[PDB]
Amino acid sequence: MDVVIAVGAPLTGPNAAFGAQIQKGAEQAAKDINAAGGINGEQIKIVLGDDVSDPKQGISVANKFVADGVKFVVGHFNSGVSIPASEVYAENGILEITPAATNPVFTERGLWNTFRTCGRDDQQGGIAGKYLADHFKDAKVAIIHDKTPYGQGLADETKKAANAAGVTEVMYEGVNVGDKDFSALISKMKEAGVSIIYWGGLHTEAGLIIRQAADQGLKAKLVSGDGIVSNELASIAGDAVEGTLNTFGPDPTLRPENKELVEKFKAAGFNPEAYTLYSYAAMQAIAGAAKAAGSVEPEKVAEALKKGSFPTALGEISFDEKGDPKLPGYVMYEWKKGPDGKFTYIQQ
Known part of the structure; x- marks a missing residue:
């Protein structure tokens, strides 16, 4: 059988x-x-x-x-x-x-x-948070998540590790999966002098954020996790995807x-x-x-x-x-x- x-x-x-x-x-x-x-x-x-x-x-x-x-x-x-x-x-x-x-x-x-x-994601966030501290110790970091168990969970694990390693984020915000206009959030990050966006979520929202940040003149590098490992990230984000960082096995x-x-x-x-x-x-x-x-x-x-x-x-x-x-x-x-x-x- x-x-x-x-x-x-x-x-x-x-x-x-x-x-x-x-x-x-x-x-x-x-x-x-x-x-x-x-x-x-x-x-x-x-x-x-x-x-x-x-x-x-x-x-x-x-x-x-x-x-x-x-x-x-x-x-x-x-x-x-x-x-x-x-x-x-x-x-x-x-x-x-x-x-x-x-x-x-x-x-x-x-x-x-x-x-x-x-x-x-406790493993993943540990690596990510430590990376933020090792490479962007003095950066103004925004931690943004997609309000899902996965996304917020990963953001929180990363936050915990980054905080312990000496990086205190200047922003911590949730966005809804399916939302596509990030102009206000990007402007807020610009006003805050954000240079690093840690993203707890998937490729769709990540790609939209990357593309819109470039268009709006926010000079920030997006850092994320395993959720963005698809060619489709590049298709959405365009050339602006270059320099993006993410953890994966x-x-x-x-x-x-x-x-x-x-x-x-x-x-x-x-x-x-x-x-x-x-x-x-x-x-x-x-x-x-x-x-x-x-x-x-x-x-x-x-x-x-x-x-x-x-x-x-x-x-x-x-x-x-x-x-x-x-x-x-x-x-x-x-x-x-x-x-x-x-x-x-x-x-x-």
Whole structure:
């Protein structure tokens, strides 16, 4: 009997590009694992669910997955979607491994079923806050967030770390996801002499802020997190994106062992940037744990995940008792033109 594994992701909406990263990564992994004999001799069957980065629609997706006999979910992208969805999964025998949701709460509720291949925002904010102090000790910093669990959570972790390292922000403000006119906020930052904008949120709002700041004559560098790692940031922001900084884990497209895999994605018409291989790796973790467990039962796969180590596109993966991966930490990237002439994030 096929092992039904769902991709829960923002396939449409503002974060569609990330939905594609997750979908393409998981789909290719399923194909590759199936070509090698499947999981414990059984083929993977992928089902898709589009959460539109909307917790309400994520819950409907979660319900659809339960009804369709889903056993494992790779996803979701947004913490505000993944946290509520994970409860539905936890109550209905479904293991969820997110490749991108970073809010600490996701693995801090004592649920048997929650795992990640990505890091978490207490780790990320620690790195970011220390970076602000190390490189912009005397700068006037504005901390702006998108009023979501993820965005404000990351801003707050960064604030805490920056504050402890001697940087006191001159502004701390929330904006609403979906809002697009930042003129007043940018003017306020200009009046305040802001030269650094720390952004707790995603690429859509980040790109709008970067572009509008340039247009309005606010000379400030935007610093953000894992939420902005898409080419679409550059598409929205334009050339003004140059110099932008953000934290992200290791870039797995740069791992030598992934050379052929990355070439294969490109031959299929997809640029497997950012979370693509984090999603690929989540599928690999499920397969490896099931192999070790001698079972495809989600509860048994969960126990196996917390015991052993497994080969993935991210490197050898293992998990702590809360479901968080033991993988390399966050590093700071800068936006610059890559060898292909496009602005992208490159590790400093």
